[PDB]
Amino acid sequence: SIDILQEKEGHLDFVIIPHYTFLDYYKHLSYNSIYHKSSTYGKYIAVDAFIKKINEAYDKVKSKCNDIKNDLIATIKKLEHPYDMNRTFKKMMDEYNTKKKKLIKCIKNHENDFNKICMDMKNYGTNLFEQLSCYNNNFCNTNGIRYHYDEYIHKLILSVKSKNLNKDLSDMTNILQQSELLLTNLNKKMGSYIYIDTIKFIHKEMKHIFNRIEYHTKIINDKTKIIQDKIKLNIWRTFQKDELLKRILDMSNEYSLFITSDHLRQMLYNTFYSKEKHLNNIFHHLIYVLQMKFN
């Protein structure tokens, strides 16, 4: 499935989550194949250039939806600013719904273009991995698993721990709760129903974003504990070729799922607060309308 995110005002983007994980997974296989033997550590910059060329091409196909994405941004600007144009919420909700439908439609159209780029990364990554060999097949070195972890994964585990993700969720629940509490009070006094309808809508969007952040936070917490336990087992020892390779695929799988949930949680956090900024404005404007009224 595809997620549509809003980092800052006027900045909509999209992620095809399975593609993100697929592409990341095959980046881990690639580095693990070249780090297994010391005679291939120099090839790191070639793997880098290849992976960046694949994402450049992936992003170029995303750029085909630029005009439909920009359409949705403008419609979202009308939705997020009912105080500037001031009538018929249903028409505005239907407008957003179809412009959003049109974006997913554009995305689905380029499915084969996206799959060819993904499948090129898979073929590239499996090519290096299928030629990974040991001096003694009964005793394959785990220094590549170690180096890759220290230089590619340990930086993200420390970074994610320094952030208190569980307090980010506490903060968001206070926001959601005080917003409903005020919302329910203002609804009993009326004013511009357009403002209450857009507050109700943005608020529900925020609960849905919160659920996704909460879900991705659980995964980040579980995967950071799983990568740290599992890394200990796959390091400081040797393995038979078969077991070393099954363990390279298992680590790559854990890393890609963690990196995915970290990427999405961060983006959904930017989206929650970007939407919250607009809820605040509409609350400010409804209170102005209500107070400067007749009795």
Partner: antibody, heavy 123, light 108 residues
Amino acid sequence: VQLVQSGAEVKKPGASVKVSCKASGYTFTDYYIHWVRQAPGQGLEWMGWINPNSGGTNYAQKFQGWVTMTRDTSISTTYMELSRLRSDDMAVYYCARDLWFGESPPYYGVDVWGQGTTVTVSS
Amino acid sequence: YELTQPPSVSVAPGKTAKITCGGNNIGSYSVHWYQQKPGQAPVLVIYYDSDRPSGIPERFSGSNSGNTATLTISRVEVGDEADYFCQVWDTNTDHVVFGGGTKLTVLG
């Protein structure tokens, strides 16, 4: 969840007072702090608020010019300076935490009050 | 913007007490209420006209419409003797306005 203010002050007219208010049981920069004064036997007078995150303030009309609100986030403490005290400034000064979590509340209201700091003014 | 409150209200231990808070179009403002016992800091007892913060008993309730907000205290205990203040936020003046207060006297 508490607000602990500094002790009773006894000052001469023309002098200044910096009263403190330390926050505990929560993240100090996530909630606005208000100051309200009370003359003996009288009502509550809103003096203004401070955003503990930015240091931005909003002074009520009657308290503009001679009240300064600042904070020290390192020690979860907000301060209010009364400049050039006069006889009529004898009052209990209170610090009070706004119930809205975060910046730019659309509406203002208090939920946690400090114990008060009596400021006595005499020559 | 002014909030006008009757200076005094007196009730019997079992009876219910109503404290009014007058204001033009107060029905469009959200009213918060504070109880301040003698020589004590105020305590929030009603917020957003009728909601009770955690730890506030069901005896305390509120309503607001037209030009009058009401704080209703059912089954008034002697410990309910306090000054009660209503409060609003007026965006036109960017001011938090408190009412003049109502002293609750309990008879018996």
